[PDB]
Structure 1
Amino acid sequence: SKLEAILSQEVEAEIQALLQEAEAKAEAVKREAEEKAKALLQARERALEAQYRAALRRAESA
């Protein structure tokens, strides 16, 4: 009915805004995890490059 349409539409739009809040929360969870992952990858690559430079210096000394 008409009042069914009113109640359903209004508080279902409230539930939809709640779902948008939940999706924004999940995106904020994923963003910092991606940041930590890429920072770990970059630090690993930096440590590897320092290791290879030390290996080249050892080969030069030999």
Structure 2
Amino acid sequence: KLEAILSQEVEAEIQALLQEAEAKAEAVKREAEEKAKALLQARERALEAQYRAALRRAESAG
């Protein structure tokens, strides 16, 4: 019938839009994990540096 056409113009948009917004809610969240990981990768190198420098200084000093 004619009401069955109407349910199909909607039922198409409301999956196109909600599939799109579940891949932005994916995407932001993927970059959020890859940032936190990298802000701790730079933190890891820094600490190392400070320890290699530190020990050399105490060897020279002594």
- TM-score of the alignment, normalized to the shorter chain, above 0.5: yes
Alpha-carbon displacement from aligned partner over 1:5-29 (angstroms, at most 9, x marks no partner)? 4432442232012100001111121
TM-score, length basis structure 2: 0.75
Q: Distance between the aligned counterparts of 1:20 and 1:29, measured in 2?
A: 15
Alpha-carbon displacement from aligned partner over 1:34-57 (angstroms, at most 9, x marks no partner)? 222111000000000101111211
Q: Percent identity?
A: 100
Q: Distance between the aligned counterparts of 1:52 and 1:30, measured in 2?
A: 34
Structure 1: segments with no counterpart, 5+ residues = none
Structure 2: segments with no counterpart, 5+ residues = none
Q: Distance between the aligned counterparts of 2:59 and 2:4, measured in 1?
A: 81
TM-score, length basis structure 1: 0.75
Question: Which aligned segments of 4 or more residues in structure 1 are displaced greater than 2 angstroms?
Answer: 2-10
